[PDB]
Design a protein around this ligand. Structure first.
Ligand code: BCL
Ligand code: BCL
Ligand code: BCL
Ligand code: BCL
Ligand code: BCL
Ligand code: BCL
Ligand code: BCL
Ligand code: BCL
Ligand SMILES: CCCCCC/C=C\CCCCCCCCCC(=O)O[C@H](COC(=O)CCCCCCCCCCCCCCC)COP(=O)(O)OC[C@@H](O)CO
Ligand SMILES: CCCCCC/C=C\CCCCCCCCCC(=O)O[C@H](COC(=O)CCCCCCCCCCCCCCC)COP(=O)(O)OC[C@@H](O)CO
Ligand SMILES: [Fe+3]
Lengths: 49, 47, 294, 32, 306, 38, 38, 38, 49, 38, 38, 38, 38, 38, 38, 49, 38, 49, 31, 49, 49
């Protein structure tokens, strides 16, 4: 239970940390893809008009 | 023309097969576990 | 070692002990306490073929069952030729024929099926009375089943006989008794407005509710170490009343039994005395208290 | 004719109602 | 570990309001236990109460406006008064005159909030006492159909007018109108599954209650104690059904059967209602394409006309 | 072996009575005999 | 030991009676024999 | 024994009887044989 | 018990053997009658045509 | 300390929120302000 | 002892109030007294 | 002890709020004041 | 014994019988073979 | 602890989400913004 | 073993059989292949 | 419980083996008859066309 | 211990999936994008 | 248990403090984005008119 | 053992069943 | 349980292995027949067109 | 319980690792086939247009 930094020690266990890392990475990738997809459907046909 | 359209199968024969199969499996499992051997009180004493 | 339990759990090590099921069947046989043998001095069969107990009432029932299934299959497969259970319809004799029934006229096989089914149902009811009488439990299940049997009697015997046509019995056959129900419901307008009808559906919905609540209550306390007063406290926290263990089963039995009784009353009444249900409520507006204030 | 038989059949419907009442009253009596 | 006393009496917000318990008497002689006792009020408890009181107030005041604030007439026509959702014009628009359809929207919103907060209360009070949380999930299963009726089905049709109208006779009218609109609602197959499960549920309830009452003499009613050790009552109850219908279940399985039947009722109902307005516009015309309508070439109509 | 005499007479007089009753009602309802206004 | 004799005779009499009754009903209702005003 | 013999004979005689009855019904109702006024 | 041959000894009891004999004889007779009846209701009117 | 402070703040923030929502709904539905296409 | 006094007064004051209200309603709705614009 | 004070304040504020709301609804719906486009 | 042999043979003979029956029904009702007056 | 922090964050995040959803629905259904073919 | 192997084979056979049957029924009823008089 | 070969010893009992033999023989016979019947209905009138 | 992490990830992945599905279906049914024959 | 300042010591645990910090930061960011989005939908079409 | 009370009582029960039966079937006729 | 290789020792029992072999063989045969049947129905009449 | 690498030791058991490997391989194969099919259906008739 000692791989997490001290500031977040009371919250996160040891195993809960690596999952959290996976979650953050996935969320960042998803946000990048979402931004690209919205720029594309925009260029196609705008929806606010 | 002679055959029931698509979605006749999906809508009516998912129920008619799935419900009958589910009943016949669930009854087998409940009766198995019930007629199995586990803790009971003696008939010669409790009654 | 490990103690197998009724709920499937195996405990990590009481007069209770592990007894195989067969033992408890041999001890509770006690042959000769049949309701029929009381009247005749003896019962003809009582020999427990397979898992099924056989009695005088069981034999007449099985006769009815076989004959009814055979007549149902003869109708709709022969003289109709549809070869599809959903498409076939088994229809009662026409209203012009009246109360008398004739082999040459159509509908003769519908009548045979109906009579055989009635015999089978009543025989089953008596068999239940009998098997309960051997065990010395009580007579609640025969009463609960007799309610629905009486509903069937009202639909197919009493209401047709009172009108006299014999065509009023609902036609057998999957997805065609629904057409009869739909044409009868609209014949008298606003069947919903019928008071005896509305009590039946109230009790049906209330029964489903009670069943869900009882099932969830017992499943929740199934496998855990608790005082057994925890469920009562939970029930007192939510809605402020706990019915008790013996109370909920009485209520289940009673509501279940009452729904069908009110229903059969409503249908028998609609056929015979009331033409439409909107005219029934015409009296309410003119109640003296408020007849002139408008 | 029609009405005599109708009343007689309504009798049978109420008789079907009957057993449930006996159940209730038995429970009331035998549970003081 | 868990103190029941501190969970039966604890001031307010964290405790019960009606501290003194009371006796009903006649309930005791016929229903078993007959004490009313205290009722617990928490944070989630006060919210559902006030939101339900807001919706009911909105609806009840709007009844009076319709009768002209006449209490004699108000008492006479109470059972056929109602408030109706907006008409087909401005189908989904939220800007409607108060009397035409504006009062319905606020009432339904506060009703939704109350329902969800009551669910939260159920869940939290179940966890607090140490028992499982099955009741909350069953209530969620019923809420599925409730939300399909009032929210999900009017949406995806474009009209708020598809929802019912907060009246005693208004709900019967809604049932009738929807069935007539789709056409031959009897033919909907998920409606058939729902009826199957509902009648099965009533069947199971009556049977379980009746057999348990019959075998009560041997103390078979206490289903919790019997789960650890099966006494003579449970042994008799198994034998009765084994001989009648050839198979039986112990005290633990039968409640699983009950739970699942009751829940499948509402789930199949919701799934079946949702599809009526969108996928299959006409149900009877669909049935004749599925080859399940009786041919009925010439019926005898002399029965139906007087 | 498991044949008692009274069971035989009971089942015999039940079957005979039911059979007589069924045959009369079929014959009466056939309407082919001109019996009781037919 | 394997089969009780009385079960055999019971099921035999029942099946035979049901079968005779069913055949007699089908033949009567077919209307192909001119029997009882046909 | 892995299978009770009597279960086999019971299911066999039930399936055979049902199958004979179903085939006899279908053939009669097809109306292709000129049997009993057809 | 010991009237059944050795090959089928683990399966059949003694009493279960005679009944099996009856069943086999009945099945053979029934098959012969079925074949005769089929030849007849063919000579009458064929069904495949 | 008979009156719990937190009960007061809970009921206060519930009543205030409900009241703001109700007034906002009534004013919008009155159609007298030309707000959101009116 | 055979009767609780308070049950008597409760039922008395309920019956009296209901009866006064019902008579007042009937007389008002009869429209035979010229009372409140009649 | 005979009368809890907090019950009094609870019922007082509930009754007052309900009464204010009812009177404002009635006055608004009467349409006699020219308030919010009337 | 992880898998009981008799369960396998039971499910096998049930599935096979149902499948033969279903195919026979479909082929008969298709009306494409001139079998039993078609 | 008189006030649990997590109750506050739970009710906050629920109220905020419901409020965003309701405002979004009202604005979309008002039809005053030319958004998604309007 | 995270899973029982036999559960996997049971669900696999069931899903495969249902899927074959559904595809065979859709293709037959589509009427696009000239199979069994089409 | 030693009549079955070693490779299949952990699966099959002794009695379960002879039945398995009967099942295999019946399945082979049924398949032969099915193939013959299919050839005959292909010679009569083909179904694919 | 004040918050379970797995409850957060469960509710997060459920809410996200539901929200993606709802938006995808609203956009498809609006008919403003010429996607799948529109 | 002692990372929170004295004024708020009776109320907040140690772990409850860092989460409160995350909540405040998120709320500030959300408010900034909300204000920007609002300014943009008036530069588009005003609602009060 | 025949008690001879059973025989007479079942005789009388059959008698009354036939009683109501025959009587109503005759009464509910054309002539 | 020793007949199974070491890699898969913690998963498979000894009896569960032979049934796995049967399953794999059946699946391969079924896939070959499925591929042949799809080549045939195509050559007959294509579905995509 | 010692076949998994140290970084993922507190999460995965021994047996849970091989099943994971199977899952990853299947997912990769499925993604490749999905990409191919999609390219094919686009070449056939595009859906955005
Ligand atoms: C437009 C049509 C009208 C309508 C017209 C009718 C009519 C007409 C009737 C009902 C009746 C019923 N309707 Mg309604 N009904 C309508 C709308 C509704 C709605 C709804 C939500 O809108 C509901 C919930 C109901 C509910 C019900 C209950 C009031 C009642 C149920 C029948 C029953 O319990 O006894 C039925 C009991 C029996 C017949 C069962 C007998 C079964 C026997 C004992 C078992 C035989 C064994 C069998 C062969 C199985 C063997 C087992 C082996 C496994 C094979 N109706 C619409 C508005 N309704 C029925 C009723 O009143 O009951 C008398 C009826 O008469
Ligand atoms: C006229 C030709 C009609 C037709 C009409 C019928 C009819 C009708 C019947 C059959 C039956 C059968 N038909 Mg054919 N059948 C036709 C075309 C076919 C075709 C085809 C061309 O593809 C086939 C393959 C078959 C094949 C068959 C078998 C599946 C089956 C009987 C086989 C057997 O011997 O019985 C298996 C063995 C026996 C039945 C054992 C019999 C047991 C004992 C002998 C029964 C005695 C009963 C006794 C009377 C009871 C009292 C005895 C007491 C001791 C007193 N039919 C055409 C359409 N077919 C029969 C069926 O299966 O019913 C069972 C059936 O009744
Ligand atoms: C345009 C004029 C309309 C009208 C439209 C409205 C509308 C719309 C509203 C009111 C509201 C009020 N009106 Mg006005 N009102 C009208 C005519 C009247 C008349 C009259 C002439 O007689 C009266 C007496 C009132 C009186 C009142 C008060 C009863 C009430 C607010 C008082 C107060 O300050 O709030 C009490 C104190 C507060 C509300 C504390 C606020 C708490 C904090 C600041 C809330 C912040 C919320 C924040 C956005 C959430 C996110 C924060 C996070 C930290 C990020 N109105 C006419 C018809 N009126 C408001 C209402 O009560 O809602 C509450 C309401 O929304
Ligand atoms: C314009 C004239 C209209 C009319 C419209 C109304 C309306 C509208 C109202 C009344 C109300 C009242 N009317 Mg008037 N009323 C009319 C004719 C009459 C006649 C008559 C001629 O016979 C009578 C006897 C009355 C008599 C009364 C009293 C019954 C009542 C308020 C009395 C009192 O002071 O409040 C009792 C004491 C108080 C209310 C205490 C107030 C408590 C605190 C100050 C509330 C603060 C609320 C605050 C905004 C919440 C936020 C605070 C937070 C700290 C931020 N009206 C005519 C028809 N009347 C009011 C009512 O009762 O509602 C309560 C009401 O709203
Ligand atoms: C175009 C102008 C439309 C209108 C359309 C909307 C719409 C639509 C919305 C609002 C919302 C709001 N409007 Mg506006 N609004 C209008 C006119 C008004 C008027 C007015 C003139 O009187 C007022 C006072 C307001 C006031 C408000 C506030 C009540 C509210 C947001 C305040 C805040 O910052 O959020 C409080 C703080 C936050 C919301 C914190 C945000 C938390 C984090 C950042 C959320 C991230 C979500 C993220 C995507 C999830 C994935 C993240 C994972 C990590 C990946 N609007 C006109 C009619 N308004 C918004 C609302 O409340 O919903 C929240 C809303 O969606
Ligand atoms: C003619 C072309 C029709 C079509 C008609 C069908 C039909 C009809 C079927 C399929 C089936 C399949 N089709 Mg195709 N199919 C079409 C177009 C497609 C397209 C496409 C262009 O995109 C695809 C990707 C597929 C893909 C597929 C697979 C999903 C599936 C079988 C794969 C496999 O080998 O089975 C997986 C492996 C096996 C099935 C193992 C088999 C197991 C053993 C061999 C079964 C023996 C059964 C035996 C008879 C029982 C008795 C044995 C006893 C021992 C005696 N089809 C077109 C529309 N397709 C088949 C399906 O899935 O059913 C399962 C199915 O029946
Ligand atoms: C449409 C053109 C042809 C046609 C084409 C074909 C073709 C082609 C075939 C058949 C096949 C058969 N047809 Mg065909 N068939 C036609 C018309 C008929 C007619 C008739 C009414 O005319 C009949 C009676 C039959 C009957 C039959 C059977 C002979 C056979 C199916 C075997 C099977 O399904 O059972 C199998 C049943 C099961 C799998 C279980 C068997 C049960 C065991 C034997 C009983 C003992 C069980 C034991 C005690 C264990 C108990 C366990 C329990 C079962 C649980 N066909 C028409 C004329 N028919 C198929 C066949 O012959 O292949 C063998 C074949 O391939
Ligand atoms: C519309 C134009 C094309 C079309 C375009 C596409 C495109 C484009 C694609 C497909 C894809 C596929 N299509 Mg297609 N497809 C068409 C017509 C068809 C037809 C036919 C009737 O004509 C068929 C049969 C198929 C079938 C298929 C499958 C081959 C495949 C989907 C895999 C998947 O969903 O399963 C996945 C199932 C699951 C995720 C679980 C699998 C279950 C496992 C394998 C079973 C073991 C479970 C184990 C024991 C553990 C048990 C766990 C319990 C289940 C919980 N298509 C038309 C012709 N199709 C997709 C595909 O190929 O990608 C692979 C693909 O991208
Ligand atoms: C040929 C037949 C055609 C008619 C078919 C009728 C079908 C339905 C309509 C009538 C319903 C039939 C159901 C009858 C069931 C009889 C049950 C019975 O006979 O029950 C008894 C009397 O009920 C009673 O009034 C029974 C009263 C019955 C009234 C007459 C019916 C009472 O038993 P209990 O004292 O409760 O046991 C209590 C236990 O706890 C004891 O420990
Ligand atoms: C009659 C009025 C028809 C209006 C149809 C309508 O307005 O359809 C609605 C969408 O409205 C929208 O986008 C606006 C739809 C505009 C009309 C589009 C044509 C609808 C065709 C009606 C048939 C339906 O709600 P959905 O977005 O499907 O999602 C809701 C479901 O997921 C809930 O589970
Ligand atoms: Fe129970």
């Amino acid at each position: 239970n000692d791989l997490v930094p001290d500031q977040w020690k009371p919250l996160f266990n040891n195993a809960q940390w690596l999952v959290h890392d996976i979650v953050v990475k996935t969320i960042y990738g998803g946000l990048i893809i979402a931004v690209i997809a919205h720029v594309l459907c925009w260029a196609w046909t705008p929806w606010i008009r | 023309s002679p055959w029931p359209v698509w979605s006749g199968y999906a809508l009516c024969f998912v129920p008619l097969a799935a419900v009958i199969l589910g009943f016949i499996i669930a009854a087998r499992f409940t009766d198995k576990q019930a007629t199995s051997a586990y803790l009971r009180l003696d008939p010669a004493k409790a009654n | 070692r490990a103690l197998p339990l009724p709920s499937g759990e195996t405990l990590p090590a009481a007069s209770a002990e592990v007894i195989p099921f067969s033992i408890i069947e041999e001890f509770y046989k006690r042959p000769g306490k049949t309701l029929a043998a009381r009247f005749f001095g003896v019962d003809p069969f009582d020999f427990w073929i397979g898992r099924f107990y056989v009695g005088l009432f069981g034999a007449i029932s099985i006769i009815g069952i076989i004959l009814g299934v055979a007549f149902y299959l003869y109708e709709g497969v022969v003289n109709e030729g549809t070869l599809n259970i959903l498409a076939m319809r088994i229809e009662p004799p026409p209203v012009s024929q009246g109360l008398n029934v004739d082999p040459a006229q159509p509908g003769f096989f519908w009548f045979l099926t109906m009579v055989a089914a009635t015999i089978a149902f009543v025989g089953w009811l008596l068999r239940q009375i009998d098997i309960s009488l051997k065990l010395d439990m009580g007579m609640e299940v025969p009463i609960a089943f007799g309610a629905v049997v009486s509903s069937w009697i009202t639909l197919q015997w009493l209401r047709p006989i009172a009108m006299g046509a014999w065509g009023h019995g609902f036609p057998l056959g999957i997805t065609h008794h629904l057409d009869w129900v739909s044409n009868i419901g609209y014949q008298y307008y606003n069947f919903f407005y019928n008071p005896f009808h509305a009590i039946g559906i109230t009790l049906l919905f209330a029964s489903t509710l009670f069943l869900h609540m009882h099932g969830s209550a017992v499943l929740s306390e199934a496998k855990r170490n608790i005082s057994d007063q925890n469920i009562h406290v939970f029930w007192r926290n939510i809605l402020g009343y706990s019915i008790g263990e013996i109370g909920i089963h009485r209520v289940a039995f009673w509501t279940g039994a009452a729904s069908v009784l009110f229903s059969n009353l409503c249908i028998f009444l609609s056929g015979t005395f009331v033409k439409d249900w909107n005219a029934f409520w015409g009296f309410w507006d003119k109640m003296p208290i408020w007849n002139g204030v408008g | 004719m029609n009405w005599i038989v109708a009343t007689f059949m309504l009798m049978f419907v109420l008789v079907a109602f009957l057993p449930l009442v006996v159940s209730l009253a038995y429970t009331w009596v035998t549970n003081p | 570990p868990i103190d029941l006393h501190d969970e039966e009496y604890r001031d307010g917000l964290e405790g019960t309001i009606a501290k003194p318990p009371g006796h009903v008497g006649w309930m005791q002689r016929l229903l078993g236990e007959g004490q009313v006792g205290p009722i617990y009020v928490g944070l989630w408890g006060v919210i559902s109460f006030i939101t339900f009181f807001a919706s009911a107030f909105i609806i009840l005041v709007d009844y009076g406006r319709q009768v002209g604030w006449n209490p004699i007439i108000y008492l006479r026509e109470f059972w056929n008064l109602a408030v109706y959702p907006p008409p087909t014009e401005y189908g989904l628009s939220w800007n409607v005159p108060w009397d035409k359809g504006g009062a319905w929207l606020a009432a339904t919103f506060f009703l939704h909030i109350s329902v969800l907060t009551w669910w939260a209360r159920l869940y939290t009070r179940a966890k607090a006492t140490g028992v499982g949380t099955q009741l909350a999930w069953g209530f969620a299963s019923a809420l599925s159909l409730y939300f399909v009726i009032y929210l999900f089905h009017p949406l995806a049709l474009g009209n708020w007018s598809a929802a019912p109208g907060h009246g005693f006779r208004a709900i019967l009218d809604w049932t009738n109108y929807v069935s007539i609109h789709w056409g031959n609602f009897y033919y909907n197959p998920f409606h058939m599954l729902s009826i199957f499960f509902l009648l099965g549920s009533t069947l199971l309830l009556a049977m379980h209650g009746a057999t348990i009452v019959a075998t009560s003499k041997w103390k078979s009613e206490m289903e919790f104690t019997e789960m650890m050790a099966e006494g003579p009552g449970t042994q008799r109850a198994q034998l009765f059904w084994r001989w009648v219908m050839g198979w039986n279940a112990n005290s633990y399985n039968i409640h699983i059967w009950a739970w699942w039947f009751a829940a499948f009722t509402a789930i199949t109902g919701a799934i079946g209602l949702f599809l009526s307005g969108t996928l299959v516009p006409d149900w009877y015309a669909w049935g004749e394409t599925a080859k399940i309508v009786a041919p009925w070439p010439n019926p005898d109509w002399a029965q139906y006309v007087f | 072996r498991p044949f008692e005499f009274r069971t035989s007479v009971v089942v015999s007089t039940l079957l005979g009575l039911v059979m007589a009753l069924l045959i009369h009602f079929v014959v009466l309802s056939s309407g082919a005999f001109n019996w009781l206004r037919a």
